[PDB]
Every structure is written in C-alpha cells, then in structure tokens.
Amino acid sequence: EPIRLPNPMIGFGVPNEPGLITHRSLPELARGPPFFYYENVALTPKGVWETISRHLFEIPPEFVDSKYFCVAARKRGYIHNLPINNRFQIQPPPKYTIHDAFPLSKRWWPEWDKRTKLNCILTCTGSAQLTNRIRVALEPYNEEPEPPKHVQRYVIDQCKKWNLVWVGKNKAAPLEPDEMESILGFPKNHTRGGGMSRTERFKSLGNSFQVDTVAYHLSVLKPIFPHGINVLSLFTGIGGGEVALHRLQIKMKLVVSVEISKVNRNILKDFWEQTNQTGELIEFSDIQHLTNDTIEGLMEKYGGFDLVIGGSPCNNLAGGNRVSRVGLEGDQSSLFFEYCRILEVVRARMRGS
DNA sequence: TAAATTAAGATTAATAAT
DNA sequence: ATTATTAATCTTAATTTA
C-alpha cells in the first residue's frame, strides 16, 4: 500500500495538540546503536518515501508540519529510530501567529488577508516586480474602503504563493534573511558572516531544518547521554541539527560534519567558536569522497557515533523545481543512498553483522 | 565575476462538490 | 464514496548589476 500522509500532519504528536503517541514498535533491524535521524520534504513525487523507508529498514516516516512549532509551515518527513516518549520542546518556543511574529505588520495588514500562518520557507524569494504589481493593483482603490473581490483574490494568492508580508502601504514583501533565521529557530545573524552572501543566505536558510521541530524530536537523547554524544552530521548545511543539540544542552563531544558548500562550512565553524563548544568539529566536503574506511578510522579514534543525522537534497523532489523534479534518482537527491552507505558503516561497528 | 534579479509549470494532496 | 476544484511547494537557470 502507498504511504498516506497523516492529516493533521502531527507525526507522533506535537505540543498543545491532541493525538500524542508515546510508544511505537520498531523493526528489529531499525534498532540502534547508532541512533539516526533522516529528514526530507514530505511532498515528493509518488513512491519516493516508500523507497526511502525501504532503505532505512522499513521504518515508517514521521510526517510533521512545523506550523505546529512556528509561524511558517514546513511539511517534512522524518525517519529515525529514536524513542518517542518524554519529548520536550526547547524554550521559549517561537511566535506562533503572524500577529505575534510580525508585530509591526498590523499597521499594514488588510482585513481581507486572513492569514495567521505563513507557508513554507523556500530558497526562492519573491521579486520586487511582484511587490510593484501588487501595489499597482491596489492603488486605484486607496480611498475605497476595500478593493473588489477579483483584485483581492489576485493579491491574496500572490501573497500565499510567494510568502509575502505587509510592510508598507499596499506593499507586500518577502521575508528577510534574519526573519527566516528566527522562524527556522536559528540565533540572529547565524548565517551572517563566513563569506555568505545575502543571495546564498536565502538558499542555505531555505534548505535548512526548522530547529524547534528537530530539537523536539532529539530531546529524548538528553537522559540517554548525560556525558554528551559523538555526532556524524551528513549534509550539515548551516548546522540545524547542531543548533538543536546546542539548544537542548546536549554536549557535542565530537561532530564529524559532511557538507560540500564552503560558506556553509564557514557558518558551522563560526557557530562552533561563537558558542564556545569544547568538543571537536571535523569538517569534510563531498560525501561521495568520504570512504568507508575513513568512517571506520574515525570511529576507532573517537569511539563510534551515538547519532547519525542529516537531510539529503530535495531539489529533485521539490514541487518548486521546474527543471529536474525527476525523483530520488536525480543527480542531487540520489545522494540519499550515500547517507545509507555511511549509516551502514556505522551500524556495522556499533551493532554488528 | 560575485552577487543580485527575475520569471520559468507540474505534481500531488487537501478540500470541496457532486 | 467519487469526482472536481483548490492549494501548497527545502527550485533552476538565464540574465543583468555593480
């Protein structure tokens, strides 16, 4: 049978909502050590998560929309072998509604824009030409109490489609990098510096984790590892998993990071020093060049990995991709099988066979 | 020439309507 | 329950700025 997405998309449960599940039955092969945590977009071409689950020991994905953790939706699938009881959220949780998340916006927000929630944060931002087109469409009705319905429809659907917020008179503009940073749960200016351009900031932020969602899942690790963990971070990006562990106060004795973007590696190392991490950070570039024996050598030096965490590329899965939405075997999304290859090396030492 | 700008539909699912 | 309509969606690439 095909994988049906859960409605509501709350996974095994989210804060302040009914339907929390405290126990599941995992397949014997799925079982740690190591713990592992895999992330990707939920809204793939047909059959993709079935294949991902087949290669991750038939674990059913946990589908969670991050709108239950912040102001912006983020419908993601999570395959992991973590315990699911006694999760807790990092504090304080981010603002839940647009009204609280954008305090100045009530000055410009139209009554007929009924959004209390933003849509997914993506790598492609709305253009200044779109802002002008919306402004021009609304101005012939400035002294009218309300524009006609067909004009309202165009503006509303463009604000949703491009995740625009009202910032000036008849002015709907996309989110700023620091706003994306805060909604995704990163500290302010996390992706400012390290040679990252504003353009690259948009892409890296759009590709990243929602930290509060991932932290809520990883929270179960805190009683398990009082002395911290050795982490294998695959497709690290701007370090969503590391920020989550940091916010959970779970010591990272070691992070071996694999991330091909140089500016992303700079952002992660900047975070490592600015938060005064006492553990060691090791940075690799291309996962395709990371050999099995290197993983085994690292485990022999540092004593294995307690957690393997990563999200492999989505560009060949994402609905926004006009060119190469060819599925799991696309040039970038096929790097999922590199995640499985590395994970299997860790499992061979940790659990055997 | 790094950085910025802009527009380029299709695929599903969720929801509404028989 | 079945069908039709609405709705969301970790993007690529060509091009221009500066």
Ligand SMILES: Nc1ncnc2c1ncn2[C@@H]1O[C@H](CSCC[C@H](N)C(=O)O)[C@@H](O)[C@H]1O
């Ligand atoms: N061959 C490769 N080796 C290593 N990393 C790669 C790669 N190809 C792509 N990547 C990286 O895979 C990442 C996928 S996006 C994942 C982002 C991460 N979860 C975060 O919190 O930010 C990107 O950062 C991309 O640069």
